[PDB]
Amino acid sequence: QQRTSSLYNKTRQFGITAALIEILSAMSSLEGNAMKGVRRNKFWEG
Amino acid sequence: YTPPEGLKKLYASDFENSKYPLNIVPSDSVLFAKFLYKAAEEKGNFDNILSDFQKIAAAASKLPIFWERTAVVEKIPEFKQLSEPTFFTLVWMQNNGMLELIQEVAEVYETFVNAKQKKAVAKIFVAPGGEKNVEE
Amino acid sequence: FFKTTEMIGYVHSIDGTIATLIPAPGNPGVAYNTIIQIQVSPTTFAAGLVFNLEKDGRIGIILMDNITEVQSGQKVMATGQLLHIPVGAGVLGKVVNPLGHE
Amino acid sequence: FKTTEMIGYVHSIDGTIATLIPAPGNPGVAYNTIIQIQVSPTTFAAGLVFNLEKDGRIGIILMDNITEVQSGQKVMATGQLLHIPVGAGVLGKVVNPLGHE
């Protein structure tokens, strides 16, 4: 029981971490593809 | 900087959606070329911008390495002799830090001018030093 | 009476086994999921597959062969056709690549 | 630490990391060197260079006096890696990673 409980705790922590890392990796990939276009502002007026 | 009234008015307008000789896919280097073409079409003279690009290319050969990183077109004397449209576009690029697209913008502007003037350019690729004979 | 290919742009970047092209202004353009030939030499080409057509006009390519010969700035020709490979009873008993090369 | 010249200004501060923007002319900063951020007219804050971007923005890892680091402050470059006192004159003392007692 002690060994299985330790494995259960370890597995849940790893699963949470892996899921969060996967989501953040997807978010970073989405952010990277985004490109900043030309700014249409009165640059001289400054 | 004190841009002219005409360039100021054209800048606010949505020239990006206007009609052009060719339908080039939108891009960062294409917006500046479209702006230059629209500015030059009003006056009717396009060769001035080509001379400005030639002067820019000649001057850039003497500027220090990575001059575009710290380039200040206002302080650079070589760009003081450029036409108002080209100087305005250069300042616009410098504001966005996109002076590395000068070659692409010049290429797109040349393509637009050739399309408008009904000129077809046939690139001839030859070995270095083998350009002497092009009769074939 | 010339074997005129369809140049669509140049090779911009190379990242391992994939590449990105930049179309030359005023060119026909390549179709999605078609095969393209990268002119590694005036007589040699490297096959590639179109995978992405971005808003900027850049094209995502999947290099298939002669990857070591691919360099940035090389010309790219568009065949305009999907991938076709030899098929028939004459291929039995042979080892072939996905491109049909024995 | 001996300063040589200003190499930019503090731009952004995200916890213990910071980013600098280039000074006029982009003097340049050697990679992995120690830079001094002038938090006050007479005090400086140590920083470690870890990233030299194409645009000219330098990535800095703040070492000490982080609470007194603000955007817009001047940054001077030492031009050398981190060096700390060593020898028999340091035995029996309590020091920090920067060598300060």
From Swiss-Prot, chain C:
Coiled coil: none annotated. Disruption phenotype: RNAi-mediated knockdown of the protein in procyclic, insect stage cells impairs assembly of the F(1) component and slows the proliferation rate of procyclic cells that are cultivated in vitro, both in the presence and in the absence of glucose in the growth medium. ATP synthesis by oxidative phosphorylation is dramatically reduced in procyclic cells. It is found in: Mitochondrion; Mitochondrion inner membrane. It comes from the Eukaryota. Disulfide bonds: none annotated. Mitochondrial membrane ATP synthase (F(1)F(o) ATP synthase) produces ATP from ADP in the presence of a proton gradient across the membrane which is generated by electron transport complexes of the respiratory chain. F-type ATPases consist of two structural domains, F(1) - containing the extramembraneous catalytic core, and F(o) - containing the membrane proton channel, linked together by a central stalk and a peripheral stalk. During catalysis, ATP synthesis in the catalytic domain of F(1) is coupled via a rotary mechanism of the central stalk subunits to proton translocation. Belongs to the ATPase alpha/beta chains family. F-type ATPases have 2 components, F(1) - the catalytic core - and F(o) - the membrane proton channel. F(1) has five subunits: alpha(3), beta(3), gamma(1), delta(1), epsilon(1), plus the additional subunit P18 (Tb427.05.1710) that is not present in F(1)F(o) ATP synthase from metazoa. Subunit P18 (Tb927.5.1710) interacts with the alpha subunit with a 1:1 stoichiometry; the interaction is direct. Subunit gamma is part of the central stalk. F(o) has three main subunits: a, b and c. This is ATP synthase subunit alpha, mitochondrial. It comes from Trypanosoma brucei brucei. The chain holds residues 45 to 146 of 584 of the full protein.
